[PDB]
Amino acid sequence: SWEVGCGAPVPLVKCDENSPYRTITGDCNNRRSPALGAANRALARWLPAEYEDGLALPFGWTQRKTRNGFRVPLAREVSNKIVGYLDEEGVLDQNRSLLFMQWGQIVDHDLDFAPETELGSNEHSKTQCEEYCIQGDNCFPIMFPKNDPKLKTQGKCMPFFRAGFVCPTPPYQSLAREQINAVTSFLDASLVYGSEPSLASRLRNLSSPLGLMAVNQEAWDHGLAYLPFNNKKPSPCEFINTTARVPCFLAGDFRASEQILLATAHTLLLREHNRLARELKKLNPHWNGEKLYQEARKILGAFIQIITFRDYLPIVLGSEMQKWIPPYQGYNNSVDPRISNVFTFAFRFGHMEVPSTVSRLDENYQPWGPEAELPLHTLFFNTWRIIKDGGIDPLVRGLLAKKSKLMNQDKMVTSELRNKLFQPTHKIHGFDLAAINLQRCRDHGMPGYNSWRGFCGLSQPKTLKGLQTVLKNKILAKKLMDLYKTPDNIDIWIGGNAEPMVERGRVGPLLACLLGRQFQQIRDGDRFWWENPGVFTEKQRDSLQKVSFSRLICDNTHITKVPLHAFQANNYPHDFVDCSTVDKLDLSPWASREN
Ligand code: HEM
Ligand SMILES: *[C@@H]1O[C@H](CO)[C@@H](O[C@@H]2O[C@H](CO)[C@@H](O)[C@H](O)[C@H]2NC(C)=O)[C@H](O)[C@H]1NC(C)=O
Ligand SMILES: *[C@@H]1O[C@H](CO)[C@@H](O)[C@H](O)[C@H]1NC(C)=O
Ligand SMILES: *[C@@H]1O[C@H](CO)[C@@H](O)[C@H](O)[C@H]1NC(C)=O
Ligand SMILES: *[C@@H]1O[C@H](CO)[C@@H](O)[C@H](O)[C@H]1NC(C)=O
Ligand SMILES: *[O-]N=O
Ligand SMILES: O=N[O-]
Ligand SMILES: [Ca+2]
């Protein structure tokens, strides 16, 4: 018995049950519950929220309020003692390319975004948080521990603002606070096309009727398209180099320019849409723009689905894949396709896969110029290195030929993210993504590690020795007990990521369970899943079965040598074959028989 429809923010229910295409918002996918999976709704709760006061205050908020009898440790202290390391030697994943990391980020961005509240809308309250390190309302600063090096150079805290939540935004909502997912839960290329109508429209080229996405008019990549710039200010991408004055890209997702390899991946995706729109016009010149946009959008969405479920998930989940994501059996309208709050933390395992450097490689997969290799932190919000320093081709080559970082219980997150992160409006390369993650799962009222172990049918260690056995690591176990004092209090992000990885995968048991279930649900509860009877023709699906990340690159760059299995660790020229030996996507089956 509780409020059973607090859905005032955004009440669109404007459904056509005939339509053969997805809405932009995700609405109308589920017929019986048309808002399921739609953007701008609460994240699903797989377990009840756990706040210090039952309703909204994070654990950690009030000094003298314990969690199960013990103070929760500072996020930055956990970062410093557990998550950090010095030596990047030996940290690379000998069987995952850098594309493996990058595809994770892409998928993540398609599925979830819980942006900071906008209550620092015309308030020095946003600057006062930064300035004076003063907790209150949505300002929840990450305070430095006593012996932190950053205390000496950066003041008392790192700023942090609580995530947006449904119902009111300035006051509270009755029942526990529920954070918003601002993008569509469906794996639907929302990161290319947008999750809101206005953005979706702004991204389109409605000046010609070719059903194209807008492209950059100020720059081109050896005649290939770039994303439009976002001509609004202040621009983080301008801030990081005011000489170059190259703004951020405008994509279907706000976060597209956070790092140069994300921007790169967005760039491939846009080009594929345009290329598909132009093929379809040839095969159907009687098709108008809307029809061309929608049909291209639908192919791209399928492409992302296939890559993710056929190529990516099996080498994340490994032995657990088959357990959580059995072969498809059609749409089930009883499944909840909403992204869970916990999943938005579980999928941050990617953070331990980001290595300290990025390379540009030439057409011989050799170093491109004299600074071919660059530190990751110089590449946050960096578009000028694309526009003015070789286009995406050198970066796409590095994605193929360089390696992801390997999760390591002793080497968890690179200092390029731990210590050198840049965030818009904060001016310095001085933040800590690990700390942010821990603060965020308190912000989101996350149950602790054992609650999730319980949920997944796994043991719940209560002692040091129990923790040691589960983590198979005495020293890590001991550091966690010293900080958290009971495994019940371990933040899920760090707890999940601390578990040794499953056979053939890159996450442990708990994360495999949380991730696997989520991915099962977004497949099974999606009316427009690519393999659902009805969505594509049988001839179309035989065509779509052939897609590969290799063909995506071949079709949309000037690269001509590629691996067959782009997520594996590949070395040139041994594991690189010519683009010609690579299957294409035959759009023959999209010819209509109208005459
Ligand atoms: C250099 C690479 C990357 C950077 C710079 C980066 C940065 C960030 C930042 C700043 C946030 C917001 C944190 C917060 O305020 O709570 C975030 C969230 C997130 N990241 Fe990463 N990240 C990277 C790679 C990845 C990868 C590889 C994955 C997954 C495979 C991933 C998954 C996520 C997810 C799920 C979130 C939560 C999104 C949401 O629901 O709000 N990221 N990341
Ligand atoms: C800001 O961007 C400018 C211009 O893109 C950078 O300058 C160029 O740097 C290259 C090497 O990458 C030199 O070969 C050129 O001579 C420079 N050209 C110009 C326009 O001066 C500059 O290094 C960047 N600064 C920072 C701090 O990132
Ligand atoms: C490398 O990775 C793939 C996918 O996990 C696997 O099939 C292959 O056998 C692996 N090679 C070795 C020897 O680890
Ligand atoms: C839209 O398409 C027309 C015709 O191809 C092209 O000339 C124009 O530059 C495009 N506009 C944008 C901003 O993408
Ligand atoms: C659909 O999902 C529900 C709940 O997840 C499950 O109980 C039911 O068996 C499924 N229905 C079909 C047709 O498989
Ligand atoms: O211009 N915004 O990322
Ligand atoms: O991924 N950027 O917040
Ligand atoms: Ca989506």
UniProtKB/Swiss-Prot annotation:
Active site location: 109 (proton acceptor)
Tree of life domain: Eukaryota
Residue stretches in coiled coil: none
Recorded catalytic activity of this chain's protein: 2 a phenolic donor + H2O2 = 2 a phenolic radical donor + 2 H2O; thiocyanate + H2O2 + H(+) = hypothiocyanous acid + H2O; iodide + H2O2 = hypoiodite + H2O
Outcome of substituting residue 108 to E: Partially bound heme and decrease in activity. Loss of heme binding and activity
Cell location: Secreted; Cytoplasm
Binding residue positions for heme b: 108, 258, 351
Disulfide linkage: 6-167, 15-28, 129-139, 133-157, 237-248, 456-513, 554-579
Molecular functions per Gene Ontology: calcium ion binding; heme binding; lactoperoxidase activity; peroxidase activity; thiocyanate peroxidase activity
Cofactor details (free text): Binds 1 Ca(2+) ion per heterodimer. Binds 1 heme b (iron(II)-protoporphyrin IX) group covalently per heterodimer.
Binding site for Ca(2+): 110, 184, 186, 188, 190
GO cellular component: basolateral plasma membrane; cytoplasm; extracellular space
Tissues where this protein is expressed: Mammary gland; milk.
Residue positions, PTM Phosphoserine: 198
Site (Transition state stabilizer): 255
Positions of post-translational 3'-nitrotyrosine modification: 365
Alphabetical keyword list: Antibiotic, Antimicrobial, Calcium, Cleavage on pair of basic residues, Cytoplasm, Disulfide bond, Glycoprotein, Heme, Hydrogen peroxide, Iron, Metal-binding, Nitration, Oxidoreductase, Peroxidase, Phosphoprotein, Secreted, Signal
Main location per the UniProt record: secreted
Cofactor(s) demanded: Ca(2+); heme b
EC number(s) on file: 1.11.1.7
Biological process, per Gene Ontology: antibacterial humoral response; defense response to bacterium; detection of chemical stimulus involved in sensory perception of bitter taste; hydrogen peroxide catabolic process; response to oxidative stress
Glycosylation site list: 95, 205, 241, 332
Other comments on record: Thiocyanate (SCN(-)) and hypothiocyanite (OSCN(-)) are bound in the distal heme cavity. The iodide ion (I(-)) occupies a position which is stabilized by the interactions with heme moiety, His-109, Arg-255 and Glu-258. Hydrogen peroxide is held between the heme iron and His-109.
Protein role: Heme-containing oxidoreductase which catalyzes the conversion of thiocyanate (SCN(-)) into antimicrobial agent hypothiocyanous acid (OSCN(-)) in the presence of hydrogen peroxide (H2O2). Also involved in the conversion of iodide (I(-)) into hypoiodite (IO(-)) in the presence of H2O2. Responsible for the inactivation of a wide range of micro-organisms and hence, important component of defense mechanism. The lactoperoxidase-SCN(-)-H2O2 system shows antibacterial properties against some streptococci strains. The lactoperoxidase-I(-)-H2O2 system shows antibacterial properties against E.coli.
Family according to the record: Belongs to the peroxidase family. XPO subfamily.
Protein name: Lactoperoxidase
Species, as recorded: Bos taurus
The gene coding this protein: LPO
Full protein: residues contained: 118 to 712 of 712
